[PDB]
Amino acid sequence: PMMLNIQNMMWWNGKRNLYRATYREKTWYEISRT
RNA sequence: AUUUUACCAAUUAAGAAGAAUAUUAUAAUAAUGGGUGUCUUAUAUUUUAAAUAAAUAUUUAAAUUCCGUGUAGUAAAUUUAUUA
Ligand SMILES: [Mg+2]
Ligand SMILES: [Mg+2]
Ligand SMILES: [Mg+2]
């Protein structure tokens, strides 16, 4: 698969990536706030 | 004695519940997939993985670089919160 630049989003097309966390405690933007 | 030639002109008041828990945004308190005329059991009713996503970010510098596609907490549970 390699999911090369595929816009897989639930609200966009109803499909989510196979390898990802179903829950995230802090969004990536919150982690960047060093 | 019967006896009126041919052609030439115009859309205007609308009578009636035959108009509404009506359309579209707006509610930051709920949420296990809604299916009524339904209704026995489930060896037959199981979807999960550290990445940009139904979670969406207050600047104009420098700087990698052969059109620089770029800005960092404002508060540490603090009052921008996905509401019916
Ligand atoms: Mg005339
Ligand atoms: Mg009428
Ligand atoms: Mg709630």
mmCIF file of N, CA and C in Angstrom, chain A residues 3 13-15 22 25 32:
data_model
loop_
_atom_site.group_PDB
_atom_site.id
_atom_site.type_symbol
_atom_site.label_atom_id
_atom_site.label_comp_id
_atom_site.label_asym_id
_atom_site.label_seq_id
_atom_site.Cartn_x
_atom_site.Cartn_y
_atom_site.Cartn_z
ATOM 1 N N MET A 3 0.511 3.959 1.211
ATOM 2 C CA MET A 3 -0.348 5.126 1.447
ATOM 3 C C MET A 3 0.332 6.433 1.043
ATOM 4 N N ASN A 13 -13.862 10.913 2.922
ATOM 5 C CA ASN A 13 -14.355 9.808 2.113
ATOM 6 C C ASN A 13 -14.794 8.595 2.923
ATOM 7 N N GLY A 14 -14.787 8.665 4.252
ATOM 8 C CA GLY A 14 -15.223 7.553 5.071
ATOM 9 C C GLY A 14 -14.200 6.462 5.281
ATOM 10 N N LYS A 15 -12.967 6.650 4.822
ATOM 11 C CA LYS A 15 -11.915 5.654 4.955
ATOM 12 C C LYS A 15 -10.763 6.227 5.765
ATOM 13 N N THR A 22 -6.181 4.853 17.013
ATOM 14 C CA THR A 22 -7.600 5.184 17.058
ATOM 15 C C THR A 22 -7.890 6.334 18.011
ATOM 16 N N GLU A 25 -4.067 11.276 22.634
ATOM 17 C CA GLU A 25 -4.252 12.091 23.830
ATOM 18 C C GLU A 25 -4.046 13.568 23.525
ATOM 19 N N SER A 32 3.742 20.041 19.221
ATOM 20 C CA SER A 32 4.689 21.006 18.679
ATOM 21 C C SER A 32 4.845 22.233 19.569
#
